[PDB]
């Protein structure tokens, strides 16, 4: 097979059958999107005009008044917090993240203080914000949110992620009512969320998405919402946003990735995975069947049961050989203690499925020899 | 010509005859560099293994023990300052940029506190640093640099740029002698410098470049220097470096951009620009000739002088109609008060030189309009 | 006799952020009644062992581990991690 | 009689960072002898008028403009910018 760019650099070939994992490069960009990125990098453009146009084009997908492209969602959090503290004032923009003497408190639920590889407080602290947690990890009430609001409060933060605790937390409507009653901006962290219109329409002033994690874009993010607060976000280009730079190539790459996301939305069906499960089950000691996720989403995976007595290796040994071989094959290892590993086809490119069943046959032969 | 991707987005086609200007997207990336960037964005890779390999490959061009690729030079300054204050300690990385109880002072010359579009202090403050300026704006002595060192000092910063005052300042050797005498890391800001080896050869512990600026790379930067301090730079990935994100596509793009810069560097000689200068001089009221840099640097440009009486327009209006036309043509306007505008061919692509003289011919016809 | 005033004493009670739960009254109110000062470790979804060790200092009084269905389950440190850290720092 | 101990008074002297020059002795020494505290405006290569306006607050005592070949020339604010800003805030 033709070696990819990473094998030519001396690195392993990675077959991602696990998901959008940050340790594997988050996402894989479509070829037609990188063609747009390549053209944008090979030409110059009036940046002031590109920021306005890309913000206009992104606003069509989210339905907001304006948008602003960032380098990532973590950068969007820092810029949105800096926008709420500085209000776009050039004197306060240059002082960030030193917000001493200003209203710099970012009110949020303690159950939303999550870690996605880096603590969300770090991005907030980069914007000059100080954390004010509300409620307990299992319960939060509205009066706790209203009591946390004071004269030093600058913004409210709502985080939407599977990392967050789901039970006992306040709703987005509670944050909208409290923020507007105190004339404060509401920041929403929807990094991995694919719903582009639901959070802007809830009344939030600034909603932050991750282009890479959600839309298979080149490294990019964007803040979307009210025109005045997006203008305060753009004001950080002479401040902290300079260290969080995204170039013209990935700005355009994000726009064409949002187009490539809405068009050709494809999901692998269970009937397409059955021939692969039959091939894996032809291996001695392996049985593969298709399983849908517990929630009921349109997501089907290849659940592979391993019989240690018949194959000679347990599921944990097989998963180690899948990553440890010449080709680094990454699979879901959550049910590994139950003798089960799963294959998520959403991040598996063409022809890589046949490479997975070939590696598994090679693992079985090296267990019976 | 075929409309580029920015024209398909509704923007003007930009012909950059001014230089590596941030308002125009900094640089134009080579097509084969984007081919490697596209292949990297379409495949997954073990990020931790990619960080080690790219640091090794970048170090082959600089001569340092190790390197670390960043999103930009401003991100490199924040990470390098954070590395000097945190020493890679995970708990201290999590607290950044809040260094309330630590040694966080960054000692630098007052004449190096410059503005490159954003104040350099903003990038230092993002790394939790506190500025301690040395000397006056016109003079700085060595005893002033020694006296600024104390227990709260975290690192020394030396900024290499034309923005800095050149006369009366201390050399890089003075910073090396003071830094190593106090066992402190020396950070050198060489963002726009094309010399990959000169500043690691000076004895500095950490040198920062801009990949886009100097090497026509996709949006990227890298810190290069001693292995122990670069290791402290990599520790920021769980902290402030997550907001200053660079993905797998631009890390690979920077490596191939350094290779392309190493296997090329064929510049536009004065004999190549003479056919263009004679074409401009053929227009009435315009006189063009070839000029070299004031400092004898091997850079040749087209010095075009405007006659207000013969042409009917002054040089300021010619430069205004060049930028304001249907094709945005940006030229150097430093000597615009002298009635002269210069054309730098380093950022001009093939065939665009004929488009500049074509617009100049049209400006001459419409001068009577 | 000075309780709950522990102004000049080692009064910090180190615990996980995911274990700061509400069972009708916040668990911090009971900790505060004994003069305790809450020191939260890790995020609400992840808690590493070095975060627990970094929160220990001269003013740390004890380590608290809350066993309840109200607490966050995934990403948290086990009881064995609290016992070993407590033994390494000679704390209850 | 209290000079140069200007504690508790408006004592800040607003000037350009590019004008903080050395003529054999730093200009900050003479300003400190008069009880002033230095508030520098802008960078060494660029200085905008809003930066000069932002340095004016409740503790500002006067504005200083330094005319000398020692100072940086390009990128600095003109004397008229200092005249207008000082007049608008009624400062010497
Ligand atoms: Cl935290
Ligand atoms: Mg079978
Ligand atoms: Mg060290
Ligand atoms: Mg400054």
HEC profile for B44-96? ECCHHHHHHHHHHHHHHHHCCCEEEEECCHHHHHHHHHHHHHHCCCHHHHHHC
Reference C73, options A167, A233, A44, B240; nearest CA is A167
Partners of residue A70 on adjacent β-strands: A221
> Coil, strand, or helix at residue A230?
helix
Helix (H) or strand (E) holding C29: helix C27-33
**A36 phi-psi bin (left φ>0, alpha ψ -120 to 50, beta other):** alpha
Report CA(D38)–ligand 4 centroid distance (Å). Answer: 13
CA B85 – ligand 3 centroid, Å: 10
In the three-class reduction of DSSP (H, G, I as helix; E, B as strand; rest coil), residue A93 is classed as helix
- DSSP 8-class letter at A37: H
Disruptive mutation site among B90, B93, B95, B102 for chain C (greatest number of C CBs within 10 Å):
B90
Report the neighbours of C using a cutoff of 3 or more CB pairs below 8 angstroms.
A, B
Chain A residues with beta carbon closer than 8 angstroms to that of B57: 9
Q: C–B contact (≥3 CB pairs within 8 Å)?
A: yes
Q: Contact A219/A72 with Cβ under 8 angstroms?
A: yes
Q: Of the candidates A362, A288, A300, A357, which has an alpha carbon nearest to the alpha carbon of residue A325?
A: A362
For β-strands A300-306 and A340-343, DSSP reports them as antiparallel
Of chain B, the end-to-end C-alpha distance in Å amounts to: 27
User: Cα(A311) to centroid of ligand 2, in Å?
Assistant: 12
Q: How many other β-carbons are positioned within 10 Å of the β-carbon of residue D46?
A: 18
In this structure, are residues D72 and D45 in contact, taking their beta carbons and an 8 Å threshold? Answer: yes
Distance from CA of A218 to the nearest CA of C (A): 27
* B217 half-sphere exposure, CB direction, 13 A CA radius: 35
Q: Which residues on chain A are in Cβ contact (under 8 Å) with D50?
A: 90-91
- Cα separation of B39 and B257, whole Å? 14
Bridge partner list, B209: B222
Q: Which residues of C touch A111 (CB under 8 A)?
A: 44
C42 CA → ligand 1 middle, Å: 7
End-to-end CA, chain C: 21
Interface of A to C at Cβ within 8 Å reads: 110-115, 119-120, 135-139, 163-165, 168
Cis peptide before B318 (omega within 30 of 0): no
* A202 annotated as belonging to a binding site for a ligand: no
Which residues of chain B form beta strands (DSSP E)?
13-17, 66-70, 105-109, 130-134, 153-159, 186-189, 206-210, 221-225, 286-292, 300-306, 327-331, 340-343
- Whether chain C lies against chain D with 3 or more Cβ pairs closer than 8 A is no
Q: What are the DSSP E strand ranges found in chain C?
A: 12-16, 37-41, 60-63
Q: Which helix (H) or strand (E) holds B350?
A: none
Return the biggest CA–CA distance within chain C.
Answer: 40
Distances (CA, A) of B189 to B80, B88, B93, B138, B156: 10, 20, 22, 20, 11
Report how far apart, in Å, the C-alpha atoms of B82 and of each of A71, A99, B119 are: 20, 19, 17
Burial of A228 (0-12, 13-18, 19+ CB in 10 A): middle
Cα-to-chain-centroid distance, residue B32: 21
Who contacts A117 (Cβ-Cβ below 8 Å, separation ≥6)?
A: A22, B238, B242
Measuring CA to CA, how many Å separate D43 from each of A136, B77, B123, B156, C41? 46, 17, 14, 19, 41
- Cα B34 from Cα A37, distance rounded (Å): 8
Judge whether B202 and B176 are in contact, CB under 8 Å: yes
Nearest Cα to Cα of residue A91 among A239, A310, A229: A239
Residues in chain C: 92
**Helix ranges (DSSP H) in A151-234:** 172-181, 198-201, 211-215, 227-234
From chain A, the residues in CB contact with C18 under 8 A are: 137, 165
Residues near C69 by beta carbon (within 8 Å), at least 6 away in sequence: none
Contact predicate B230/B65, CB 8 Å:
yes
The C-alpha atoms of residue B84 and residue B90 are separated, in whole angstroms, by 13
Q: Is B291 helix (H, G, I), strand (E, B) or coil?
A: strand
Angular region, B70: left φ>0, alpha ψ -120 to 50, beta rest: beta
Instruction: Burial-class residue A4 by CB neighbours within 10 Å (0-12, 13-18, 19+).
Output: middle
| SS3 call for B161 | coil
Task: Report CA torsion sign: B209, B215, B221, B226.
Answer: negative
Segment holding A225, helix H or strand E: strand A221-225
Look at residue A153 and give its three-state secondary structure.
strand
| Phi and psi torsions of B336, nearest 5° | -65, -30
A161 to each of A194, A212, A261, B158, C34, how far by Cα in Å? 11, 15, 20, 42, 36
Q: What angle do CA B82, B85, B89 make, to 5 degrees?
A: 85
Report the chain A residue with the minimal C-alpha distance to residue B50.
A11
Residue C13 CA, chain-centre distance (Å), reads 5
Nearby residues of B38 by Cβ (< 8 Å), 6 or more positions away: A29, A31, A34, A35, A37, A38, B249
**Which residue of B lies nearest to A23 if distances are taken between CA atoms?**
B47
* Ligand with minimal distance to B88 CA: 3
B173-194: string of b/e by CB count within 10 Å (b at 16+)? ebbbbbbeeeebbbbbbbbbbe
From chain A, the residues in CB contact with D54 under 8 A are: 90-91
**Neighbouring residues of A275: CB distance < 8 A, sequence distance ≥ 6:** none
Q: Is B189 in a helix, a strand, or coil?
A: strand
**Looking at chain B, which residue has its C-alpha nearest residue C53?**
B91
- Closest to C63 in 3D by CA, of C43, C92, C87: C92
**Cα B8 from Cα D67, distance rounded (Å):** 52
C19 to each of A139, B2, B238, C22, C29, how far by Cα in Å?
12, 62, 23, 9, 14
Neighbours of D52 (CB within 10 A): 21
């Amino acid at each position: 097979m033709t070696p990819n760019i990473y094998q030519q650099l001396g690195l392993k070939k990675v077959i991602n059958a696990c998901g959008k994992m940050t340790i594997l490069g988050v996402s894989s960009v479509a070829p037609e999107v990188m063609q747009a990125t390549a053209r944008a990098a090979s030409a110059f453009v009036e940046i002031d005009a590109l920021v306005e146009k890309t913000g206009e084009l992104v606003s069509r997908y989210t339905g907001a008044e304006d948008s602003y492209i960032t380098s990532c969602a973590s950068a969007g959090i820092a810029i949105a917090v800096a926008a709420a503290i500085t209000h776009g004032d050039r004197a306060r923009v240059a002082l960030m993240p030193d917000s001493s003497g200003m209203a710099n408190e970012v009110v949020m639920l303690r159950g939303h203080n999550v870690d996605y590889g880096a603590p969300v407080t770090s991005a907030i602290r980069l914007g000059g914000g100080r954390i004010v947690e509300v409620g307990s990890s299992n319960l939060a009430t509205r009066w706790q949110l209203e009591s946390a609001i004071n004269e030093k409060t600058a913004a409210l933060l709502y985080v939407k992620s599977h990392h967050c605790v789901q039970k006992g937390m306040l709703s987005i409507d509670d944050f909208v009512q409290v923020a507007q009653a105190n004339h404060l901006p509401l920041i929403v962290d929807a990094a991995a969320e694919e719903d582009l219109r639901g959070w802007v329409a809830s009344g939030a002033d600034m909603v932050i998405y991750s282009g890479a994690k959600a839309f298979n874009a080149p490294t990019s993010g964007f803040i979307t919402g009210r025109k005045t607060w997006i203008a305060a976000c753009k004001a950080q280009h002479q401040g902290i946003a300079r260290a969080m730079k995204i170039g013209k190539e990935n700005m355009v790459g994000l726009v064409y990735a949002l187009e490539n996301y809405h068009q050709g939305q494809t999901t692998v069906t269970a009937a397409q995975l059955q021939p692969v499960a039959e091939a894996i089950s032809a291996i001695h000691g392996l049985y593969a069947d298709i399983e849908q996720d517990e929630a009921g989403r349109a997501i089907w995976r290849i659940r592979v049961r391993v019989n240690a007595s018949e194959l000679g290796l347990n599921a944990q040994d097989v998963e180690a050989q899948l990553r440890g071989g010449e080709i680094a094959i990454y699979a879901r290892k959550y049910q590994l203690h139950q003798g089960v590993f799963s294959l998520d086809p959403r991040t598996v490119a063409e022809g890589e499925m046949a490479l997975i069943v070939a590696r598994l046959r090679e693992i079985a032969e090296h267990a019976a020899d």
